[PDB]
Amino acid sequence: NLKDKILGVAKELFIKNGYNATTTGEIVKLSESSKGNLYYHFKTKENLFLEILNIQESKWQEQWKKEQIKAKTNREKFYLYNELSLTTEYYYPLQNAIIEFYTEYYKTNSINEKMNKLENKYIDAYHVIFKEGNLNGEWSINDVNAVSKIAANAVNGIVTFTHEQNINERIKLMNKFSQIFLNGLS
Amino acid sequence: NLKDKILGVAKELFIKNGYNATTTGEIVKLSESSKGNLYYHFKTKENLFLEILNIQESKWQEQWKKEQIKAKTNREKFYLYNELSLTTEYYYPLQNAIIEFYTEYYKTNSINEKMNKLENKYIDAYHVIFKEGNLNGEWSINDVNAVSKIAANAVNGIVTFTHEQNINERIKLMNKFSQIFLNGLS
Numbered sequence: 001n002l003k004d005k006i007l008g009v010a011k012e013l014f015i016k017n018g019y020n021a022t023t024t025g026e027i028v029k030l031s032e033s034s035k036g037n038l039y040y041h042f043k044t045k046e047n048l049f050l051e052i053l054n055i056q057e058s059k060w061q062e063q064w065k066k067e068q069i070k071a072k073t074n075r076e077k078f079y080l081y082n083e084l085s086l087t088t089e090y091y092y093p094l095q096n097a098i099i100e101f102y103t104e105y106y107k108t109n110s111i112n113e114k115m116n117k118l119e120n121k122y123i124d125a126y127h128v129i130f131k132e133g134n135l136n137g138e139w140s141i142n143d144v145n146a147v148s149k150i151a152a153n154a155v156n157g158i159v160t161f162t163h164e165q166n167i168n169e170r171i172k173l174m175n176k177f178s179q180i181f182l183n184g185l186s
Numbered sequence: 187n188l189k190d191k192i193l194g195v196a197k198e199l200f201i202k203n204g205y206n207a208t209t210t211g212e213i214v215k216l217s218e219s220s221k222g223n224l225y226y227h228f229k230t231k232e233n234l235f236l237e238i239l240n241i242q243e244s245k246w247q248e249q250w251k252k253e254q255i256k257a258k259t260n261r262e263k264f265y266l267y268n269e270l271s272l273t274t275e276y277y278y279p280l281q282n283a284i285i286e287f288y289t290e291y292y293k294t295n296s297i298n299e300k301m302n303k304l305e306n307k308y309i310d311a312y313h314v315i316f317k318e319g320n321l322n323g324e325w326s327i328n329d330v331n332a333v334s335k336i337a338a339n340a341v342n343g344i345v346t347f348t349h350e351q352n353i354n355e356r357i358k359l360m361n362k363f364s365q366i367f368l369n370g371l372s
């Protein structure tokens with residue numbers, strides 16, 4: 001719980017001041033813990049952050065599990081999962097901390113190892129869709145693993161670098177992408 | 187020179203270190219200059235950045251012209267563009283700094299002028315390609331501007347969120363994408 005409290009407090013601080021501005025001092029002092037207990041649970045700020053990301057990751061996966069009930073077929077799932085990514089990220093509180101963190105340790109192979117396992121989970125979602133799609137003749141894909149990585153990265157770019165138009169138009173583009181990409185399969 | 191050494195050290199900084207991580211101070215310190223010269227064309231960190239950006243975009247659009255000839259059919263122009271994006275040393279190595287910058291100075295307006303101008307050269311390459319493809323009957327797109335934006339961003343996603351894994355796999359993935367995207371256009 002002292003650990004859970006650290007995670008909880010830390011999260012709010014990152015949300016409030018981004019990754020860089022947040023100090024383990026604050027986290028310690030605000031969660032009424034100690035540098036010693038923090039170091040024992042996470043060693044470094046980098047790591048602490050990574051765990052929070054892991055936890056958020058599971059919340060997302062859990063939200064998806066419930067949200068996909070609105071999408072019957074796998075082609076629909078693809079449409080919905082992308083839509084979701086776009087909208088949720090628009091107002092995700094940690095988004096800012098993530099950017100900071102990401103663009104700081106993406107050069108360091110150390111803090112890039114754990115980051116991979118995390119991203120893979122995110123891709124996994126797609127792997128599932130395309131695979132279940134094969135068992136339903138919605139499409140026939142030779143190597144799911146490749147397409148999955150492609151969709152995941154193409155969708156995120158469309159999400160990250162689109163920042164400029166009204167959310168309404170964004171969805172339209174995102175859905176157009178789904179349409180096209182799903183059509184480039186078959 | 188002076189004004190150029192700025193854009194130089196500034197660029198080298200914006201890439202290696204993040205956007206926020208780089209400051210006017212670090213400049214003059216490694217640029218051996220003053221903190222006042224920054225004003226005639228550099229009204230703020232933004233303009234200095236939005237400037238270096240535009241410059242690099244040009245550096246990239248230049249290489250593209252000198253090399254696009256290797257591709258005959260527009261279907262090839264598309265593939266070559268996306269492949270080159272992965273190997274260039276222009277503009278793309280700043281996407282990080284860019285993301286970051288888009289989560290801070292995206293409220294002001296006096297900047298969104300130089301901004302959108304640059305977001306044009308970004309999708310223009312695709313506008314030409316797709317359009318010239320409508321003539322040669324290589325495909326039929328009745329919404330070039332949309333598809334253009336979609337592709338530019340999708341591709342940018344692939345370049346950016348893979349910069350850490352085998353450059354060979356990168357090219358492989360990128361081409362597998364171009365194939366699918368194009369195959370989904372008709």
Ligand SMILES: CN(C)c1ccc(C(=C2C=CC(=[N+](C)C)C=C2)c2ccccc2)cc1
Pocket residue numbers: 060085088089092098099102119120122123149151152153156160347
């Ligand atoms: C809040 N939310 C749902 C999400 C939040 C972030 C991501 C991201 C990402 C991009 C490409 C990935 N791939 C394909 C390796 C994995 C993750 C991501 C976006 C910007 C910077 C770093 C990573 C995804 C979903």
